[PDB]
Ligand binder design. Structure first.
Ligand SMILES: OC[C@H]1NC[C@H](O)[C@@H](O)[C@@H]1O
Ligand SMILES: OC[C@H]1NC[C@H](O)[C@@H](O)[C@@H]1O
Ligand SMILES: OC[C@H]1NC[C@H](O)[C@@H](O)[C@@H]1O
Ligand SMILES: [Mg+2]
Ligand SMILES: [Mg+2]
Ligand SMILES: [Mg+2]
Ligand SMILES: [Mg+2]
Lengths: 781, 206, 206
């Protein structure tokens, strides 16, 4: 069995740099607390025992209420009068830092307005190892850079709005199967322990840990340790994971909270780096363990100060208002137990926090549409004589937009996946609705919507008369506690749901101007229809939230040129992706073993390595205009040589070998600041190229910079930077970025540091991972 | 919920069959999930200590319904003998050590359980448990001091014997004829018999 | 549709089992809905006059499939003897009187029908039609020359005799064993028999 070595003591905060003010105030607060009060900050109150998805204990003596921790990564869960934003995978498809930031801000606003202290998101774990992983859509992209950049922007948005963000799930939670034994037992599996994600040190550093480093460096206030084990130690009591990787190497200054009921070694978890136990025994035992010296006072002091530093860092002292909604009822009033008898109290204020957030949701919707094919199908005008709309995915959830709890169904248009990663829709504009409005406000031609996937006779009938047929298909997935159609969180296949492929084929056989819109959580196998000559256009539109239909028509009818690029690969087969899902336990009754044997070769890296050609490669998308790439130029910057970090920490302040050691500790060679040794972010090269709009309409291009690191075990290419750029017809721009030292380095397990190998490196600039228009060597120095 | 039942109603209605059960020599009682007069059955001293164990002089053991709420160690004082399904074991041990629960009580709990055991002759009739509630698999894994043991979990012991006979007979004996204006009995020589209703047919899922 | 079949194929394949039918003494033929070489079977003189009634020398009567299209009176000349289900009556009468259908043709049509009748002994075995195709009701109305009569329309005559035996036997003999790798036969002493598939179960509508 793969093994996780111990690493103690649990590092205490430095409170240097951007964390100094927050640390100073956290220290002044914690100094005033009893042991009991400090412990309260670390202890969840109990599942459904208060208002939020999780709450800490309070400190009434100082008029300090317990923190409110609330889902989700795309909105405020279990709340009324809130917005439903596009999923993270949609954000990834925008390739747009600014939009990710603004989505974060708006979500932050909504959480703040409700009294939430901690938004439980965004997500960089799962990263996206498996194309059929159930919760990938909550995150961004299998690519660590795309994910890391947009993760960071999202965090800055949330925290700038005055709410603590929570990077989750740390780490290796790449599938839902066997994530939690009780859950697996519910599915008829006999195991007593969560699966172990077995990840080698190199793979961790270069893939899964990378976006979490970005999260740390972006100033995220909290992390959530995952349900699964990593090398046969539960994330939430994995000393190597938390004490070494997170709190030493990445020098995380904030607090680590457990996933809800994520198994840990109680008091041992605290020594291994856990700061907060959710949802709530730990309170009492922590108090006792401090009193008898099993847990040193500086540990509990550090737990409390991390929590309070996060609080002050985002300005919770300024922005906090009373929690004005209840997670567990929509009723205005409810009975509560009193010291004597009961009271009848206000539990929901129905505070409307939506503001103008429908605009940014429509915009991100449009920006996340990816044009995969267009042989003269798009844009439409709205003056078409006869428009046919086809597929259940065009239509309404007949149970109401919030008719499936936690969105645990696939009724009507798919705008959101299922599980904790959800929010209630204030409304839902369907494609059927938006398309009919478009026509009836313009040319007022014929339009008919056949939204029963079994009604094939009607689809032929209508398609054969149509000037254009717009076909809607979907594929759904979500968190493991919900099973839909035999998908136990994870997808059981990469097929279109509800006979979608049949809908496409039926319509395309009858209409030679067929448009296909895919609302999918991830890739599906399209080999059998994408190349159908009668299919004149194909878009992926993902999970667009409340404005789905409107955001779509803005693109389809040409008000917005599509500018998204696919943030994952569309392969010919499931086998193309490699990394099959473990769906049968392989360690008897013990922890199943998901070995990450493919290393860094997931998604496009795998395709490139094995020379499999994608149908649509990572980073690919079309426009209503054309772009041209020219004149790459590489400038060496002659950065200072890399210095491994060195020296000591301070002694642990007060306000398993080494676990009670509060003496000064040696700094790790790759640590020394939040996000890693600062020398890693030194700029080594400046790289430029010219992008020109050679077409006839204004449009966005997403230029992409890839690096070949040049070793035999390196990917042929890895994404390193990108931007989204609006260009008028004929307009040119010089796209200039820099490559950091980290950008051109490899992880060396022996030296425990990032190294620039002697293999020659090549830089590429292009429009996708396969359309590498420009290249130049990176000259060593 | 609290079932609020006066003393007379209890004695003349709900308790009566339970008295019959005691007197028939029943080895165990299971205390219910609900409360009676705002005390949970499994920690209701009036119910268990007074009515069951004094007035009805029950000699066997009281087990809780599965997760039937009680005041932990105080349940034992109130007449509970066995906690199902389970985290009170170490708490009962402690309560005995610190004197909150007398020795004679834990002793009486143990001896009630064993008394029931010997009363029906478990000592003569016990055989290993040869089936598993949670799987039909023949084998399965169990954790060990080190690694795992692969063990037999179902022996598929056929215990049905001839009990289909009594099940058929009781089926027939439990038919109640509520109306008959020349409808029954039938002969089997009817020219055309219609059978109507899903309640006549098979469970299509097995 | 026109089934286009060459002379050799007809003779060596499709016609062959019909020759056997003729030779078995079959009393009637039914001409088909389709065309053969672009002439409707029921008005196809090559098919009825030549192949069936000359070469195969069929002595019985040809009846049309129900509403099988034909050239009216012209069909009679092409070898049709009976038009089902039924304008042809009076047109045929007319055609005889005005000379378009020879007296000998109609005479032959009638004698073919009556020949079939006597060949199987309908004169001996005919009984009243004692059921109705269109209702299961015992009685019904029929129009009289004045008013209506209420008449028996179904007698529910049970003709099944012992025919369940032959049906069971032919059932068994028509079973084809395509594969057997130690699977069959069974004994009825299997510990656990699973039956699977809707094709095992009842038509829930009766
Ligand atoms: O609902 C709270 C918590 N439950 C479990 C999920 O894994 C996590 O993402 C979520 O934040
Ligand atoms: O299944 C165990 C237990 N569950 C609860 C029921 O109330 C009880 O009758 C049953 O014996
Ligand atoms: O039911 C009358 C008649 N209808 C048409 C069929 O083809 C034929 O076989 C049948 O005898
Ligand atoms: Mg409540
Ligand atoms: Mg540090
Ligand atoms: Mg007594
Ligand atoms: Mg002749």
């Amino acid at each position: 069995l793969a093994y996780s070595p111990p690493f103690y003591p649990s590092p205490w905060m430095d409170g240097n740099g951007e964390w100094a003010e927050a640390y100073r105030r956290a220290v002044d607060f914690v100094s005033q607390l009893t042991l009991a009060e400090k412990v309260n900050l670390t202890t969840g109150v109990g599942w459904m025992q208060e208002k939020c998805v999780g709450e800490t204990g309070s400190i009434p003596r100082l008029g300090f209420r317990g923190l409110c921790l609330q889902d989700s990564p795309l909105g405020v869960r279990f709340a009324d009068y809130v917005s439903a934003f596009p999923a993270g995978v949609n954000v990834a498809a925008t390739w747009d830092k600014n939009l990710a930031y603004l989505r974060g801000k708006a979500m932050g606003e909504e959480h703040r307005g409700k009294g939430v202290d901690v938004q439980l998101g965004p997500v960089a774990g799962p990263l996206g190892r498996h194309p059929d992983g159930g919760r990938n859509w909550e995150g961004f992209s299998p690519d660590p850079v795309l994910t890391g950049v947009l993760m960071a922007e999202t965090i800055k948005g949330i925290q700038d709005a005055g709410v603590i963000a929570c990077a989750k799930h740390f780490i290796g939670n790449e599938m839902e199967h066997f994530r939690q034994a009780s859950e697996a037992v519910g599915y008829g599996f006999d195991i007593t322990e969560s699966v172990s994600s077995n990840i080698d040190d190199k793979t961790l550093h270069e893939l899964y840990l990378w976006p979490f480093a970005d999260a740390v460096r972006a100033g995220v206030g909290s992390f959530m340790c995952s349900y699964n084990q990593v090398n046969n130690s539960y994330s939430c009591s994995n000393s190597y994971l938390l004490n070494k990787l997170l709190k030493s190497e990445l020098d995380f200054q904030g607090f680590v909270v457990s996933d809800w009921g994520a198994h840990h070694s109680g008091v041992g978890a605290a020594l291994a780096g856990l700061d907060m136990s959710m949802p709530g025994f730990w309170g009492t035992n922590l108090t006792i363990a401090v009193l008898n010296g099993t847990v040193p006072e500086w540990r509990v002091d550090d737990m409390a100060v991390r929590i309070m530093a996060a609080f002050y860092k985002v300005g919770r002292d300024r922005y906090q208002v009373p929690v004005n909604f209840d997670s567990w009822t929509r009723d205005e009033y409810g009975y509560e137990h009193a010291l004597v008898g009961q009271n009848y109290v206000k539990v929901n204020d129905k505070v409307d926090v939506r503001a103008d957030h429908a605009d940014i949701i429509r915009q991100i919707g449009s920006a996340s549409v990816v044009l995969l094919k267009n042989d003269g199908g798009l844009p439409l005008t709205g003056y078409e004589k006869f428009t046919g709309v086809f597929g259940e995915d065009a239509g309404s959830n007949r149970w109401g937009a919030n008719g499936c709890s936690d969105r645990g169904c696939d009724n009507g248009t798919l705008a959101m996946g299922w599980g904790s990663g959800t929010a209630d829709f204030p409304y839902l504009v369907t494609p059927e609705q938006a398309i009919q409005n478009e026509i009836l406000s313009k040319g007022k031609g014929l339009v008919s919507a056949v939204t029963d996937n079994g009604a094939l006779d009607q689809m032929e009938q209508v398609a054969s008369q149509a000037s254009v047929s717009i076909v809607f298909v979907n594929a759904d997935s979500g968190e493991g506690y919900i099973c839909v159609d035999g998908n136990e969180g994870d997808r059981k296949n990469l097929t279109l749901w509800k006979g979608g492929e049949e809908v496409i084929k039926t319509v395309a056989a009858n209409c030679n101007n067929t448009i296909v819109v895919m609302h999918t959580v991830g890739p599906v196998l399209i080999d059998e229809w994408y190349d159908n000559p009668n299919v004149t256009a194909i878009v992926w539109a993902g999970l667009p939230g409340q404005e789905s239909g409107n955001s779509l028509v803005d693109v389809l009818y040409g008000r917005v040129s599509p500018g998204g690029k696919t943030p994952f690969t569309w392969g010919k087969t499931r086998e193309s992706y490699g990394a099959p899902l473990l769906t049968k336990p392989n360690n008897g009754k013990g922890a199943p073993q998901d070995d990450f044997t493919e290393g860094v070769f997931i998604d496009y890296r795998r395709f490139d390595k094995y020379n499999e050609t994608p149908i649509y490669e990572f980073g690919f998308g079309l426009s209503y205009t054309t772009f041209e790439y020219s004149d790459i130029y590489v400038q060496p910057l002659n950065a200072r040589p890399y210095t491994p970090a060195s020296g000591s920490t301070k002694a642990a302040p007060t306000f398993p070998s080494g676990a009670t050691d509060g003496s000064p500790q040696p700094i790790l060679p790759a640590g020394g600041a939040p996000g890693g040794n600062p020398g890693l972010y030194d700029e080594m090269y400046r790289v430029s190229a010219i992008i020109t709009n050679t077409g006839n309409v204004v449009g966005d291009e997403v230029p992409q910079l890839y690096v070949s690191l040049g070793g035999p075990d390196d990917p042929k290419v890895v994404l390193r930077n990108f931007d989204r750029i609006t260009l008028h017809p004929g307009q040119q721009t010089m796209w200039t970025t820099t490559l950091t030292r980290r950008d051109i380095s490899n992880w060396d397990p022996a030296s425990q540091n990032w190294v620039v190998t002697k293999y020659p490196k090549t830089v590429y600039i292009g429009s996708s991972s396969r359309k590498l228009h420009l290249q130049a060597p990176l000259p060593p120095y």
